[PDB]
Ligand binder design. Structure first.
Ligand SMILES: CCCCCCCCCCCCCCCCCC(=O)OC[C@H](COP(=O)(O)OCCN)OC(=O)CCCCCCCCCCCCCCCCC
Ligand SMILES: CCCCCCCCCCCCCCCCCC(=O)OC[C@H](COP(=O)(O)OCCN)OC(=O)CCCCCCCCCCCCCCCCC
Ligand SMILES: CCCCCCCCCCCCCCCCCC(=O)OC[C@H](COP(=O)(O)OCCN)OC(=O)CCCCCCCCCCCCCCCCC
Ligand SMILES: CCCCCCCCCCCCCCCCCC(=O)OC[C@H](COP(=O)(O)OCCN)OC(=O)CCCCCCCCCCCCCCCCC
Ligand SMILES: CCCCCCCCCCCC(=O)OC[C@H](COP(=O)(O)OCC[N+](C)(C)C)OC(=O)CCCCCCCCCCC
Ligand SMILES: CCCCCCCCCCCC(=O)OC[C@H](COP(=O)(O)OCC[N+](C)(C)C)OC(=O)CCCCCCCCCCC
Ligand SMILES: CCCCCCCCCCCC(=O)OC[C@H](COP(=O)(O)OCC[N+](C)(C)C)OC(=O)CCCCCCCCCCC
Lengths: 95, 80, 60, 130, 118, 169, 506, 70, 108, 161, 105
């Protein structure tokens, strides 16, 4: 119920597809793949990607983490540690 | 149609809808009591029917308060 | 008294580095609330177009 | 003030302070084996949950719901004219009041500078018009 | 008489049927609050009058007042009955449901033409 | 590619059933993850035909990846608050293994029933066993698809498992 | 006395200010009320006079020597339970203040005791329905007394819904009988015992089976007992069974008059399934209260075999078994409440969260009890061995007397199945003992200053400070020695159960 | 609103007495009072607990200004 | 089965309902195998009882194991044959023991 | 034509297709009304009026709770059903409306014979009160006790204080 | 002994006498077994449902069908509408087929 069902392979796989829909230099994305160097995102492109990765996983990056994020693997680490399913109504669970 | 439990599709998908089913099910017992008491011309059955109505209304209130407090627990932050 | 929702206290920033971070944080908030703008204001365009419009104003 | 991990625009993860002792439980076992032997299948077993919802630090992601917001707008007998009083109610209890004005702002102060002192006098008849 | 009028209370709250009008919704809450207030008092007052004649027939209650009008022995109950009637009918000083200065028209704010007449 | 196309139909069908009956959420993630890797697989093997053996190595990699991730989490802890990430990895391994065992390929015992006579016959002709590389030589890595009915990698695992049993040093 | 003193306590509790001490002292007044109720009841009700069966209140109630014994047992066990809320269970405020934070706790108990004692006496279908609601409503209010607890409220919602469905089944059964005969009094209905549909009374029993957690309706009780606070779970898991099972015995006494073997087979089917679920259900569980929930389901199946056989040997079996099982139930929950003081404190894997309502929630929180408190650990071992049925403890004679009645009536299958069920359930009973003691030597010389008990201060360093409070220690000592040494007085106690008659006479 | 239901049932329970006041005589009258006296304890309980008030979520408390002088 | 499909259509976004419906859900081979196994059991139990001029534990052991094996070979196709026989022997023994003990009660 | 059959046919149709919680609180009122009318016209007019007096007050309290707990869930959700499966289900249900299988009890009509011995002629409610307040006074006093418990029970559940 | 089967006017109803004779038989000390009171039990149950009497009417109706007897020639005349309990049907000397007044007594 109110617990995460996320694996490191799924979060990475969903992260790559969401990053593939952008205009990146390379489609070969792994954990070590940096945003500035490998994919080539400026200030605004990076934050478009972060919000896009927010919507996919229903998570919200904190300001401190978002400003300091470098690699794709850091995003996968953040999603796994912070993801929570949204609370449901009083009827969804007990019925 | 009853033996395949068709009544399980007629009950709604909220906790309050279960409460309504219980009230309807108990009301079926009272209608059966009134029907038998009137045919027999027996006031003891009608006294029983009156008792069922009052008691069935008591558990309706007790169950509602539990559901009321259950909803309050979810809305507990109340920072306002 | 209390301020309205989503209100920030006015402060004069004296550091260009600190100013840059504040701008980037606000730009993210515009993107996140883009789907809300389409909902409340009943726009005839996708939220993707709204985010594009936001970026243009920040790029100016 | 600032989007943080446990609190942002769209949801928060509220945890209360722990009143009870931080009791440590290790070596969970059943009569057929240790916890790790069945923890793969324990997701379907509600009686195998190690996190209790009554604990003050139980993680719950709650969407930030707008409180009941009422436009006590211009079209209302209570407002003495054009006042878009925005009230955030808890039932009927007022929690925050946001009076929006300027629905009758006509730039009298700007217009007065373009008028002579005699010409600007009738503008004052129309500020407090009772 | 009491049972029939209780149905009218139900028909009033149906207007705020998951409605998007906040003034209709705010008025539905007040209708329930007023119903809880007056229903017990109005029912019990009529039961005392019925108890004095030991009948639940309205015509028998009228004919029981040949030598005395119940205004004299039950002057306090006549005030309470009228106070309850004002609350039941949502009439001032208990017009909290259709308070124009508070909820524009209450449950009637979205009603026009025939639904408003009825 | 008849078996490959039939196999990918069952995976798609289980996705349709899962959405229809609201089955386990984690299973939805597994099937969705399999289809994406299948999408990558089709791109890089066009015109070459797709036997189920090439699909077998795709699911084998997914099973091995999550087992490695599960091992780290089940030793140093899962990062989520409810500590379920490590067990989620193993739960997905079961779902992937369900489809892996439904492919028309040899089981672990059939492949071991053919390599074990080779591992033993190497040791008796030579005395001591040092590396599996002496056992890969006596394996016909050209015709193990219809006489053995196995992929290129499933034979590799069987030899490596058998080598660690039989090694004398 | 109960009704009169309840009204005074209701008003008095709302008059004085709210403080933990005042609520605790009001609980002690509730203790005095039950004691006076027992003394008054003993002074007027005697086994020899009530053997015939005496009607009261226009024949709405019927008290006999079988009903009277259960009423006194209910009053005695309720006395022991109130000592938990009227005295210190641990002595540490972080744990004990919970029992004093609800002023209506004692009021609800007195409300439920009235329903518990009147239910076995019902002699009319109208009053049967009224009383079974009175007992059920008080149980719901007690399950929800801690309304600031999410699990406690969730349990009360589950309890209300399931218990209302059972009540409707019970009401539907009585309405069907009234429709058949046009009669409401039980003794009048007995005159037509051969002509009414006897399965209309099985529907009445089915609603009663739901309220005792019998299979297949066992799921909700296992869920509720595990989610409720340990103080609440102690009461609600035992008290409804004392009255409802006694009422089921009286109903089955009337059913056996017509000797409908088809009805006997359906009940045997429910007993058979409950033995299977009660034994195999507890094998893979980690919570102690979930384990005890299956233990309760298993021991109810044993008693229902005696109730089903329903003979002279069944009165002795049921009466003795219900008394000794109540004491074992009270003793185990008393120890579980006490031993929270030996819980280690952090200063982590699996993110285990423990709340103030149920500090002892997992079986492995009982680890090293043999080291922390050997006398209490032995007391818990004696109780668990009694549930196993190790002679000459009380639990052995309970199973022995149940088997006699069951085998005397030709229930060969159920007698064999329960003995297999006893062996299967021994696996999870032994697991408690394994946790308590089996690691004693490999852990004897260790430094454990991280316990909950170590947070308590010391008075003078020259005084002797007992680690457990006086009242709760004496109760555990008394009940454990009764369980252990019942062989001394077993002959005299079973001769008393011979005299308890249910229209035997001659 | 919840407490309306118990009191509504109590009022509806007096209907049998209204039309039978003469027949039951003094015995019924005393029973009628006992019915009302048990329910009056609920009225005392609701008054003393202040359960029939309005559950506000804000509370206005006057803080005292104090100076930790040195 | 078709009653529960209605409950599915009425709600599929509620995990609580879906979890409970999945427990009671029967596969297609179980919807056919269960009536066949019960029908074969009833036929073979009565057929053997007629043969022996009464019901015996051996007759019930044979009827239950064969009825189980027939059903197991239908709704447990994807399991080894020896596994189905192992369950059928276990199932047949339970009912033979049930008859040996005199069903639910010795009665007279 | 017994038009109550049509009313229950419509009610059964709307109970199968009901989606949100407001429709359920309307199924309740759509059930009490056929009960009240049929009691009024066939068996007991006294209990037809008692049902209206008590259940309506319970209905409004039930309705006001829906306002405080409505949680957006079922307005935007989707249901599948199918018109054909609904009507077929209702057709099969309508086929068997014989709750009893005593054909003679269901087919043969009976009568009662009036007598003039009851010269003290009063309503059913006066006899019900006469027995309830004299012979079954214990039942009345227990009911009073249960009503008191509900008053205390509601407060100890809902009141935060 | 509590009252059972109380009529709508407070006295015994139609079936009270049958019930009273059952109680007197069952509680009499002159009876060795309850066999003497078996016929009294059937009489009480017949007073309420009339199941055997309805069964007899079932046989008579069915037996009349098989011999071709006309239902309207061997039964009892009846009227279904209360408004048409006219004076001609009632047999009055100056009878008429006009409807009777049932609107307000
Ligand atoms: C307080 C304990 C008082 C014990 C009184 C037991 C009792 O009720 O009397 C015996 C009873 C038969 O009583 P009866 O013959 O009907 O009436 C006249 C008898 N004087 O026989 C019975 O039916 C009693 C049935 C229940 C017996 C329960 C046995 C309880 C064992 C002692 C409780 C443990 C004491 C722990 C001490 C803690 C206090 C510090
Ligand atoms: C028509 C609907 C289906 C009928 C349901 C009957 C319910 C009441 C019957 C009594 C059993 C009560 C136990 C709780 C009811 C079980 C609810 C259920 O049916 O769920 C099925 C459950 C889940 O199994 P699973 O295969 O994992 O889920 C299906 C996946 N599609 O699978 C189970 O685990 C069910 C088995 C529960 C254990 C019952 C065992 C009782 C004892 C039987 C053996 C008796 C022992 C004596 C034998 C000797 C005599 C021969
Ligand atoms: C699965 C199958 C494994 C074996 C099943 C039972 C075989 C053991 C057995 O007893 O077979 C006998 C069986 C019929 O049983 P029976 O009632 O004895 O036949 C009438 C004799 N006059 O005969 C059979 O048909 C088998
Ligand atoms: C004076 C007459 C008053 C009633 C006239 C209106 C007729 C509509 C149906 C009245 C009751 C018939 C049975 C309905 C039971 C409740 C089921 C329900 O949900 O209401 C039906 C109504 C129609 O909505 P619809 O669009 O057709 O279906 C949803 C599509 N997604 O969905 C709605 O939510 C609208 C409901 C409006 C409020 C109705 C409150 C109930 C009033 C019942 C009083 C009469 C008692 C029932 C008598 C008929 C019995 C069948
Ligand atoms: C209070 C003022 C009304 C009042 O006093 O009204 C009551 C009185 C007195 O009438 P009564 O004694 O109640 O009986 C009624 C007797 N008639 C039938 C003659 C009216 O009516 C008037 O004098 C007018
Ligand atoms: C035993 C004999 C019974 C007498 C029968 C009558 C009972 C009436 C009780 C009134 C009490 C009261 O007015 O109560 C006042 C309450 C609450 O007031 P509060 O907050 O307590 O302040 C007052 C307390 N002081 C002054 C002690 C501080 O609300 C009201 O203002 C109610 C106003 C009702 C007006 C309705 C108009 C009706 C017009 C009728 C024309 C025919
Ligand atoms: C070990 C005991 C087995 C007895 C042999 C037997 O019962 O033999 C096996 C029976 C045969 O019984 P049958 O062929 O119906 O009757 C025989 C022919 N007659 C009608 C002429 C007599 O069948 C079964 O498989 C029954 C399974 C029995 C399991 C018993 C479990 C042990 C319980 C312990 C009791 C204290």
């Amino acid at each position: 119920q109110s617990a995460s069902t996320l694996t490191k392979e799924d979060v990475l796989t969903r992260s790559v597809s969401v990053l593939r829909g952008f205009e990146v230099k390379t489609k070969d994305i792994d954990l070590q793949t940096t945003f500035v160097q490998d994919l080539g995102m400026d200030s605004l492109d990076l934050n478009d990607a972060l919000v896009a990765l927010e919507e996919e996983f229903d998570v919200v990056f904190d300001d401190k983490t978002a400003n300091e994020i470098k690699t794709v693997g850091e995003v996968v680490d953040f999603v796994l540690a912070n993801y929570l399913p949204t609370e449901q109504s009083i009827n969804h669970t007990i019925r | 149609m009853d033996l395949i439990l068709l009544m399980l599709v007629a009950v709604g998908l909220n906790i309050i809808d279960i409460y309504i089913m219980i009230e309807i099910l108990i009301m079926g017992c009272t209608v059966n009591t009134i029907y038998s008491a009137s045919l027999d011309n027996d006031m003891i059955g009608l006294i029983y029917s009156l008792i069922q109505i009052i008691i069935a209304g008591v558990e309706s209130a007790i169950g509602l308060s539990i559901l009321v407090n259950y909803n309050r627990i979810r809305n507990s932050e109340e920072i306002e | 008294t209390n301020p309205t929702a989503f209100a920030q206290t006015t402060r004069y920033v004296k550091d260009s580095t600190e100013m840059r971070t504040l701008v980037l944080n606000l730009y993210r908030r515009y993107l996140r609330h883009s789907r809300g703008f389409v909902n409340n204001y009943n726009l005839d365009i996708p939220a993707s177009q709204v985010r594009t419009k936001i970026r243009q104003e920040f790029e100016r | 003030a600032a989007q943080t991990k446990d609190n942002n625009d769209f949801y928060d993860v509220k945890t209360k302070k722990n009143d009870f002792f931080p009791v440590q439980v290790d070596g969970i076992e059943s009569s057929l084996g240790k916890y790790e032997e069945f923890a793969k299948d324990a997701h379907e077993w509600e009686s195998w949950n190690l996190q209790n919802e009554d604990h003050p630090e139980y993680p719950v992601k709650r969407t930030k719901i707008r409180h009941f917001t009422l436009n006590f707008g211009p079209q209302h007998p209570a407002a003495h004219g054009v006042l878009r009083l925005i009230l955030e109610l808890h039932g009927e209890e007022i929690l925050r009041s946001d009076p929006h004005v300027g629905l009758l702002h006509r730039g009298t102060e700007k217009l007065i500078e373009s008028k002579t002192y005699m010409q600007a006098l009738p503008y004052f008849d129309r500020l407090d018009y009772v | 008489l009491l049972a029939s009028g209780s149905i009218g209370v139900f028909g009033t709250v149906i207007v705020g049927w998951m409605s998007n009008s906040k003034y209709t919704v705010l008025a539905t809450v007040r209708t329930t609050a007023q119903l809880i207030s007056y229903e017990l008092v109005l029912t019990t007052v009529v039961f005392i009058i019925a108890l004095i004649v030991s009948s639940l027939n309205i015509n028998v209650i009228i004919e029981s007042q040949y030598n005395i009008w119940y205004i004299i022995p039950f002057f306090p109950l006549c005030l309470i009955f009228f106070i309850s009637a004002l609350a039941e009918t949502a009439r001032p000083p208990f017009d909290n449901v259709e308070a124009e200065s508070e909820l524009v028209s209450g449950h009637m704010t979205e009603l026009s033409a025939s639904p408003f007449v009825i | 590619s008849s078996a490959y196309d039939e196999a990918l139909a069952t995976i798609r069908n289980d996705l349709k059933l899962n959405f229809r009956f609201k089955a386990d959420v984690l299973e939805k993630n597994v099937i969705r993850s399999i289809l994406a890797e299948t999408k990558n697989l089709e791109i890089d093997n066009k015109d070459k035909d797709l036997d189920e053996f090439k699909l077998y190595d795709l699911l084998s990699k997914m099973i091995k990846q999550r087992q490695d991730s599960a091992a780290i989490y089940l030793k140093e802890g899962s990062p989520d608050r409810f500590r379920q990430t490590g067990w989620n990895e193993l739960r997905e391994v079961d779902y992937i293994t369900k489809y892996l065992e439904a492919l028309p390929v040899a089981s672990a015992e059939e492949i071991e029933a053919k390599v074990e006579p080779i591992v033993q016959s190497v040791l008796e002709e030579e005395g001591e066993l040092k590396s599996p590389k002496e056992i890969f030589s006596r394996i016909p890595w050209k015709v193990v698809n219809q006489d053995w009915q196995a992929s290129e990698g499933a034979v590799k695992n069987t030899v490596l498992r058998l080598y660690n049993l039989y090694k004398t040093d | 006395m109960l009704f009169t003193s309840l009204l005074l306590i209701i008003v008095y509790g709302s008059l004085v200010n709210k403080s933990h001490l005042l609520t605790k002292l009001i609980n002690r007044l509730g203790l005095i009320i039950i004691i006076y109720t027992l003394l008054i009841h003993l002074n007027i009700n005697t086994l020899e006079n009530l053997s015939i069966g005496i009607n009261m209140f226009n024949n709405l109630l019927l008290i006999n020597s079988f009903n009277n014994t259960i009423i006194e047992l209910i009053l005695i066990i309720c006395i022991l339970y109130v000592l938990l809320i009227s005295f210190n269970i641990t002595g540490l405020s972080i744990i004990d203040n919970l029992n004093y934070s609800k002023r209506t706790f004692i009021v609800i108990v007195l409300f439920n005791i009235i329903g518990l004692t009147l239910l076995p006496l019902v002699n009319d279908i109208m009053i049967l329905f009224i009383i079974i609601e009175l007992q059920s409503y008080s149980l719901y209010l007690l399950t929800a007394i801690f309304n600031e607890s999410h699990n406690s409220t969730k349990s009360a919602l589950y309890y209300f819904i399931v218990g209302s469905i059972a009540s409707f089944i019970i009401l539907d059964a009585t309405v069907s009988i009234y429709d058949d005969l046009g009669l409401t009094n039980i003794q009048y209905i007995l005159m037509y015992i051969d002509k009414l549909e006897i399965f209309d009374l099985l529907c009445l029993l089915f609603g009663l089976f739901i309220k005792i957690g019998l299979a297949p309706f066992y799921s909700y009780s296992i869920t509720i007992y595990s989610l409720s606070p340990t103080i609440i779970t102690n009461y609600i898991s035992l008290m409804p069974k004392l009255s409802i099972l006694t009422l089921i015995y009286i109903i089955m006494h009337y059913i056996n008059i017509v000797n409908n073997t088809d009805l006997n087979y359906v009940i045997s089917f429910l007993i058979l399934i409950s033995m299977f679920i009660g034994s195999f259900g507890g094998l893979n569980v980690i919570r102690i209260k979930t384990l005890l929930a299956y233990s309760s389901l298993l021991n109810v199946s044993y008693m229902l075999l005696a109730i089903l056989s329903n003979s002279n040997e069944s009165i002795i079996a049921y009466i003795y078994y219900i008394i000794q099982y109540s004491l074992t139930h009270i003793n185990i929950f008393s120890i579980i409440l006490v031993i929270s003081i030996y819980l280690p404190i952090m200063n982590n894997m699996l993110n285990v969260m423990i709340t103030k309502y149920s500090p002892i929630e997992y079986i492995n929180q009982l680890k090293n009890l043999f080291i922390n408190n050997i006398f209490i650990a032995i007391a818990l071992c004696i109780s668990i061995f009694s549930l196993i049925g190790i002679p000459p403890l009380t639990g052995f004679y309970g199973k022995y007397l149940v088997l006699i009645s069951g085998l005397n009536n030709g229930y060969v299958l159920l007698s064999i199945v329960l003995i297999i069920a006893s062996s299967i359930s021994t696996v999870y009973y032994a697991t408690i003992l394994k946790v308590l003691s089996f690691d004693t030597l490999s852990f004897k010389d260790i430094i454990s200053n991280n316990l909950i008990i170590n947070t308590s201060p010391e008075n003078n360093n020259n005084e002797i400070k007992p680690e457990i409070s006086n009242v709760i220690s004496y109760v555990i000592s008394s009940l454990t020695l009764i369980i252990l040494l019942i062989i001394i007085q077993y002959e005299n106690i079973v001769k008393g159960a011979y005299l308890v008659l249910l229209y035997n006479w001659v | 609103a919840l407490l309306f239901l118990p009191f509504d049932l109590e009022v509806s329970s007096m209907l049998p007495y209204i039309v039978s006041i003469y027949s039951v005589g003094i015995y019924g009258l005393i029973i009628f009072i006992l019915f009302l006296l048990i329910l009056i304890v609920g009225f005392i309980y609701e008054f003393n607990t202040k359960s029939l008030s309005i559950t506000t979520i804000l509370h206005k408390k006057n803080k005292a200004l104090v100076k930790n002088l040195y | 089965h078709f009653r529960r499909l209605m409950q599915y259509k009425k709600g599929s976004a509620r995990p609580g309902l879906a979890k409970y419906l999945n427990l009671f859900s029967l596969s297609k081979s179980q919807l056919i195998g269960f009536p066949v196994a019960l029908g074969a059991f009833s036929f073979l139990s009565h057929s053997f009882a007629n043969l022996q001029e009464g019901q015996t534990a051996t007759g019930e052991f044979a009827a239950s194991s064969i009825a189980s094996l027939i059903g197991l070979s239908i709704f447990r196709t994807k399991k080894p044959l020896s596994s189905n026989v192992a369950i059928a022997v276990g199932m047949g023994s339970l009912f033979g023991f049930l008859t040996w003990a005199g069903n639910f009660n010795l009665g007279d | 034509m017994n038009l109550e059959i049509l009313d229950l046919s419509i009610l059964g149709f709307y109970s199968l297709i009901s989606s949100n919680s407001f429709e359920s609180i309307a199924i309740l009122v759509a059930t009490i009304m056929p009960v009240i009318t049929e009691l009024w016209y066939n068996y007991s007019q006294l209990f037809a009026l008692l049902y209206t007096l008590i259940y309506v007050g319970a209905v409004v309290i039930l309705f006001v709770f829906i306002l405080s707990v409505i949680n957006e869930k079922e307005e935007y959700e989707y249901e599948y059903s199918g018109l054909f499966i609904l009507i077929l289900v209702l057709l099969l249900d309508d086929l068997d409306d014989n709750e009893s299988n005593d054909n003679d009890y269901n087919n043969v009509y009976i009568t009662d014979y009036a007598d003039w011995f009851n010269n003290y002629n009063e309503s059913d409610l006066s006899v019900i009160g006469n027995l309830l307040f004299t012979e079954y006074a214990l039942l009345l006093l227990i009911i009073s006790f249960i009503l008191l418990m509900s008053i205390i029970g509601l407060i100890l559940i809902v009141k935060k204080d | 002994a509590p009252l059972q089967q109380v009529g709508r006017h407070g006295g015994p109803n139609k079936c009270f006498g049958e019930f009273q004779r059952v109680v007197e038989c069952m509680t009499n000390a002159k009876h060795d077994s309850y066999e003497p009171c078996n016929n009294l039990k059937n009489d009480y149950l017949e007073c309420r449902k009339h199941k055997v009497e309805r069964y007899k009417a079932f046989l008579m109706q069915k037996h009349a069908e098989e011999l071709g007897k006309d239902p309207e020639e061997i039964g009892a005349p009846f009227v279904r509408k209360r408004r048409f309990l006219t004076s001609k049907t009632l047999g009055l000397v100056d009878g008429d087929d006009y409807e009777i007044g049932v609107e307000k007594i």
